[PDB]
Amino acid sequence: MKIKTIKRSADDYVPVKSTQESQMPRNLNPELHPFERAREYTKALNATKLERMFAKPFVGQLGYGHRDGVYAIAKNYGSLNKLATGSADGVIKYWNMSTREEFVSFKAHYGLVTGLCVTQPRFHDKKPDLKSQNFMLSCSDDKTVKLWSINVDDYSNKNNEEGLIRTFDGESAFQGIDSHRENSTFATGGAKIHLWDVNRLKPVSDLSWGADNITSLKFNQNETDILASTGSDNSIVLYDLRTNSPTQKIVQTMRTNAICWNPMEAFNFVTANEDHNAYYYDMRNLSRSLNVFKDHVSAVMDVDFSPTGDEIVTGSYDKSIRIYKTNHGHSREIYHTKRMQHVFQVKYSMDSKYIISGSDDGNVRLWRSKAWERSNVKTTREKNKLEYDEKLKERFRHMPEIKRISRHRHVPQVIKKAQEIKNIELSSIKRREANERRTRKDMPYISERKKQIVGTVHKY
Amino acid sequence: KYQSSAVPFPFENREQYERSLRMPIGQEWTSRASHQELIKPRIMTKPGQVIDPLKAPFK
Amino acid sequence: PIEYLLFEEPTGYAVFKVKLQQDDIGSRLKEVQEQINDFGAFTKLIELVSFAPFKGAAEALENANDISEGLVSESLKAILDLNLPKASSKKKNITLAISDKNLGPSIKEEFPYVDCISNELAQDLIRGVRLHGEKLFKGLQSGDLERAQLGLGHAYSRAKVKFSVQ
Amino acid sequence: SKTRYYLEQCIPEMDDLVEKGLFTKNEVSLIMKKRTDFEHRLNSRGSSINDYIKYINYESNVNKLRAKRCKRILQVKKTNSLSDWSIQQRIGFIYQRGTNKFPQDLKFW
Amino acid sequence: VRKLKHHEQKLLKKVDFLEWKQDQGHRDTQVMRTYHIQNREDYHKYNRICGDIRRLANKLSLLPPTDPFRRKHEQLLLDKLYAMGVLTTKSKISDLENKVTVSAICRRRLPVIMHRLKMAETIQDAVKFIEQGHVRVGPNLINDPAYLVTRNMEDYVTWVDNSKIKKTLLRYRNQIDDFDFS
Amino acid sequence: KERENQNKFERSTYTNNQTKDKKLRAGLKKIDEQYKKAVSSAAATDYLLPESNGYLEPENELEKTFKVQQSEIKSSVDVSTANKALDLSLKEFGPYHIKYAKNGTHLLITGRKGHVASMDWRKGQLRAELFLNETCHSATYLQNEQYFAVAQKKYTFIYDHEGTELHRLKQHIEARHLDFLPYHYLLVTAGETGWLKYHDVSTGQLVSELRTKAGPTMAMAQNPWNAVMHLGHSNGTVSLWSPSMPEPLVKLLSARGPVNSIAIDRSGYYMATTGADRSMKIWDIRNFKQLHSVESLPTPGTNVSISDTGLLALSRGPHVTLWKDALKLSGDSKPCFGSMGGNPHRNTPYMSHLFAGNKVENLGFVPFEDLLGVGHQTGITNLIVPGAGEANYDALELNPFETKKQRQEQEVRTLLNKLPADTITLDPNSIGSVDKRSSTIRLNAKDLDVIEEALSRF
RNA sequence: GGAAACUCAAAGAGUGCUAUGCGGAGUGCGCGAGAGCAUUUCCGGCAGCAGAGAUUUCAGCUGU
User: Which DSSP state fits C134?
Assistant: G
Axis-axis angle for helices C74-83, C103-110 (nearest 10): 60
**Residue F155: burial class (beta carbons within 10 Å; 0-12, 13-18, 19+):** buried
Neighbours of E2 (CB within 10 A): 12
Report CB contact under 8 Å: D25, F45. Answer: no
Which residues, including other chains, have CB under 8 Å from residue A261's CB and lie 6 or more apart? A218, A219, A220, A221, A228, A268, A269, A305
Q: Is the dihedral of CA D73, D79, D81, D83 positive or negative?
A: positive
Q: CA–CA separation, A217 vs F41, rounded Å?
A: 54
Q: Give CA–CA dist F297/F255, Å, rounded.
A: 13
Is A243 within 8 Å of A201 (Cβ atoms)? no
Do β-strands F279-284 and A331-335 pair in parallel, antiparallel, or remain unpaired?
unpaired
Q: Which of C43, C138, C141 to mutate to test the interface with D (most CBs of D within 10 A)?
A: C138
CA F226 and chain centroid, separation: 10
Q: Closest Cα to residue F224, out of F182, F172, F257, F193?
A: F182
Q: What is the number of residues in chain B? A: 59
Find the Cα–Cα–Cα–Cα dihedral F306, F274, F178, F175, rounded to 10°: -170
CA-based nearest residue to F214, from F178, F241, F183, F181? F241
- The sheet with strand F205-211 has its strands ordered as F177-181, F186-190, F195-200, F205-211
Residue D72 is classified by DSSP as I
Distance of CA F266 to the CA centre of its chain: 5
Contacts of C22 in chain B (CB under 8 A): 48
- Tell me the torsion sign for CA atoms A430, A431, A436, A442: positive
Rounded CA–C1' distance between E167 and G3, in angstroms: 35
Could you count the other beta carbons within 10 Å of the beta carbon of residue F412?
17
Q: What distance in Å separates the CA atoms of residue D48 and residue D98, rounded to the nearest whole number?
A: 9
After which residues does chain F have a break in its backbone, defined as C to next N over 2.5 Å?
A: 17, 448
Residues in chain F whose Cβ is within 8 Å of chain D: 2, 41, 44-45, 47-48, 50-51
CA distance C53 to chain B (A): 32
Q: How far, in Å, CA of F247 to CA of F311, rounded?
A: 32
From D94, A312, F366, select the one nearest F374 (Cα to Cα). F366
Q: How far apart are CA F174 and CA F192, in angstroms?
A: 7
Alpha carbon distance F231, F259 (integer Å)? 9
| Strand blocks (E) in F102-185 | 106-111, 115-120, 125-131, 139-141, 148-151, 156-159, 165-168, 177-181
Question: Which ranges in A35-129 belong to alpha helices (H)?
Answer: 36-54
Phi and psi, residue A384, nearest 5° = -70, -35
Residues contacting residue F172 through CB under 8 Å, at least 6 positions apart: F151, F155, F156, F189, F191, F197, F199
Torsion-angle region of residue A76: left (phi > 0), alpha (psi -120 to 50) or beta? beta
Pick the closest to residue C141 from C40, C12, C8 (CA basis): C12
Measured distance CA(A269)–CA(A302) in Å, rounded: 13
Which helix or strand (DSSP H or E) is residue F240 part of?
A: strand F237-241
What angle is formed at CA E101 by the lines to CA E96 and CA E102, rounded to 5 degrees? 140
Estimate the crossing angle of helix D49-69 against helix D83-101, to 10 degrees: 170
Asked if residues A296 and A322 have their Cβ atoms less than 8 Å apart, the reply is yes
DSSP string for residues in A163-210: S-SEEEE-SS-EEEEEE-SSTTEEEEEESS-EEEETT-SS-SEE--SS
Asked whether the beta carbons of residue D33 and residue A12 sit closer than 8 angstroms, the reply is yes
Q: If residue A238 lies in a helix (H) or strand (E), which one and from where to where? A: strand A235-240
For A31, counting Cβ atoms within 10 Å of its Cβ (0-12 exposed, 13-18 middle, 19+ buried), the class is middle
Strands A291-293 and A300-305: unpaired
Query: Measuring CA to CA, how many Å separate A264 from each of A221, A442, B46, B51?
Result: 9, 41, 17, 11
F313 phi/psi in degrees, rounded to 5: -130, 120
Q: Could you give the CA distance from residue E87 to residue F325 in angstroms, rounded to a whole number? A: 72
- Cβ–Cβ < 8 Å for F437, B4: no
CA D29-D34-D36 angle, 5° bins: 90
The closest of E85, E27, E98, E104 to E57, measured between CA atoms, is E98
- Judge whether F266 and F226 are in contact, CB under 8 Å: no
Report which secondary-structure segment, H or E, holds F100.
Answer: strand F96-100
F177, F190 contact by CB (below 8 A): yes
Angle F269-F273-F276 from CA coordinates, rounded to 5°: 170
Report whether C101 contacts C115 (CB < 8 A): no
| A171/A81 Cα distance (integer angstroms) | 36
Measured over the CA atoms of residue D58, residue D59, residue D60 and residue D62, the dihedral's sign is positive
Strand order, beta sheet including A174-179? A174-179, A185-190, A194-197, A205-206
Cα E132 from chain centroid (whole Å): 20
CA at A13, C1' at G5: how many angstroms apart? 29
Partner-chain contact A24 D4, CB within 8 Å? yes
Integer distance in angstroms from CA A164 to C1' G31?
38
Are A4 and F57 in contact by the 8 Å Cβ rule? The answer is no
Question: Which of A115, A118, A120, A121 is closest to A199 using CA atoms?
Answer: A121
Answer yes or no: are the C-beta atoms of A322 and A329 closer than 8 Å: no
Q: Pick the closest to residue F310 from F325, F299, F298 (CA basis).
A: F325
Strand partners, A355: A348, A367
Give F126's strand partners.
F119
Residues sharing a CB contact under 8 Å with residue D77, sequence separation 6 or more, in sequence order: D70, D71
Cβ neighbors of A227 (< 8 A, separation 6 or more) are: A178, A180, A187, A217, A218, A219, A220, A238, A239, A240, A241
Q: Which resolution, in Å, applies to this structure? A: 3.8
Residue A231 identity: G
Judged by CB atoms closer than 8 Å, whether chains meet at C32 and A158 is answered as: no
Pairing of strands E135-137, C114-117: unpaired
Beta strands (DSSP E) in chain C are 4-8, 12-18, 46-53, 94-97, 114-117
Q: What is the DSSP letter of F19?
A: -
> In angstroms, how far is G47 C1' from A319 CA?
88
Q: Please name every residue paired with F134 in a beta bridge, in sequence order, or none if there are none.
A: none
Q: Cα–Cα distance between A403 and F438 in angstroms, integer? A: 19
Rounded distance between C-alpha atoms, residue A423 and residue F110, angstroms: 66
- The residues on D that touch B, with CB distances below 8 Å, are 4-5, 8-9
For residue F190, CA distances in Å to A332, B53, C63, D67, D107 come to 49, 68, 84, 65, 69
Pairing of strands A226-231, A235-240: antiparallel
Q: Are strands F379-384 and A2-4 parallel, antiparallel or unpaired?
A: unpaired
Rounded alpha-carbon distances, angstroms, from residue A299 to A254, A276, A319, A415, C35: 10, 5, 11, 13, 42
- Residue A118 belongs to what H/E stretch? strand A113-119
According to DSSP, residue F299 is labeled S
Do residues A85 and A67 touch, judged by C-beta distance below 8 A?
no
How far apart CA E21 and CA E23 sit, in angstroms, is 5
Cα F108 to Cα A158, A297, F16, F407, distances in angstroms: 79, 65, 49, 18
The beta strand positions in F15-65, using DSSP E, are 55-57
Chain E contact for A50 (CB, 8 A cutoff): yes
Note whether B38 contacts D: Cβ–Cβ < 8 A.
no
Please choose, from the candidates A205, A260, A200, A201, the residue with its C-alpha nearest in 3D space to the C-alpha of residue A230: A260
- Which phi-psi region, left, alpha or beta, contains residue C162 (left: φ > 0; alpha: ψ -120 to 50)? left
Which residues on chain C place their C-beta less than 8 Å from a C-beta of chain B?
A: 1, 20-24
Angstrom distances, CA of residue C130 to CA of A263, C1, C93, C134, D32 = 40, 21, 26, 9, 44
CA distances E160 to A108, E132, E182, Å, are: 109, 12, 9
Category of C68 on φ-ψ map: left (φ > 0), alpha (ψ -120 to 50) or beta: alpha
Chains B and A touch (3+ CB pairs under 8 A): yes
C-alpha span between A398 and A407 (Å, rounded) = 11
- Is the Cβ–Cβ distance between E109 and E148 less than 8 Å? yes
Asked if residue F191 lies in contact with residue F176, where contact means CB atoms within 8 angstroms, the answer is yes
Peptide bond into F58 cis (omega under 30): no
E strand or H helix that includes residue C140: none
**Burial (Cβ within 10 Å: 0-12, 13-18, ≥19) of residue A67:** middle
C-alpha–C-alpha distance, residues F368 and A74, integer Å: 66
Phi, psi angle pair for F272, to nearest 5°: -105, 130
The dihedral sign for the CA sequence E67, E69, E72, E78: negative
CA A400 to chain centre: 30
- The whole-angstrom distance between residue E38's C-alpha and the CA centroid of its chain comes to 12
Which of C2, C6, C24 to mutate against chain A (most A CBs within 10 Å)? C24
DSSP A279-303: EEEESS-TTS-SEEE---SS-EEEE
- Measure the CA–CA gap between E79 and E93, rounded to whole angstroms: 11
As a whole number of Å, the end-to-end CA separation of chain A is: 90
Residue closest to C127 by CA, chosen among C37, C29, C65, C50:
C37
Checking E46-50 for CB contacts under 8 A at 24+ apart, the result is: E46/E102, E46/E105, E46/E106, E47/E102, E49/E105, E50/E100, E50/E101, E50/E102, E50/E105
Which nucleotides of chain G does any protein CB come within 7 A of?
8-13, 16-23, 30-31, 44-46
Integer Cα distance of C95 and A5 in angstroms: 64
The answer for residues whose C-beta is within 8 angstroms of residue A241's C-beta and 6 or more apart is: A180, A185, A195, A225, A226, A227
- Find out whether D40 and D3 touch, Cβ atoms under 8 Å: yes
DSSP assignment of A8-44 equals --SSSSS-SSSSSPPP------TTTS--HHHHHHHHH
- Tally of CA atoms within 13 A in the half-sphere of A455 that contains its CB: 8
Q: Are A133 and A124 in contact (CB under 8 A)?
A: no
CA dist A442 and F304 (Å) reads 75
Cα-Cα-Cα-Cα torsion E20, E25, E27, E28, nearest 10 degrees, comes to: 0
Cα Rg, chain B, nearest whole Å? 18
> What is the number of other CB atoms lying within 10 angstroms of the CB of residue F22?
8
Q: Which residues of F318-354 are buried (b: 16+ CB within 10 A; e: fewer)?
A: bbbbbbbebbeeeeebbbbbeeeeeeeebbbbbbbbe
By what technique were these coordinates determined? cryo-EM
CA nearest to E34, candidates E141, E42, E49: E42
Q: B10 at the A interface (CB within 8 A)?
A: no
Can you give the distance from the CA of residue A31 to the C1' of nucleotide G52 in angstroms?
63
- In Å, the largest CA–CA distance within chain F is 112
Quick one: closest CA in B to A27, which residue? B28
C60: helix, strand or coil: helix
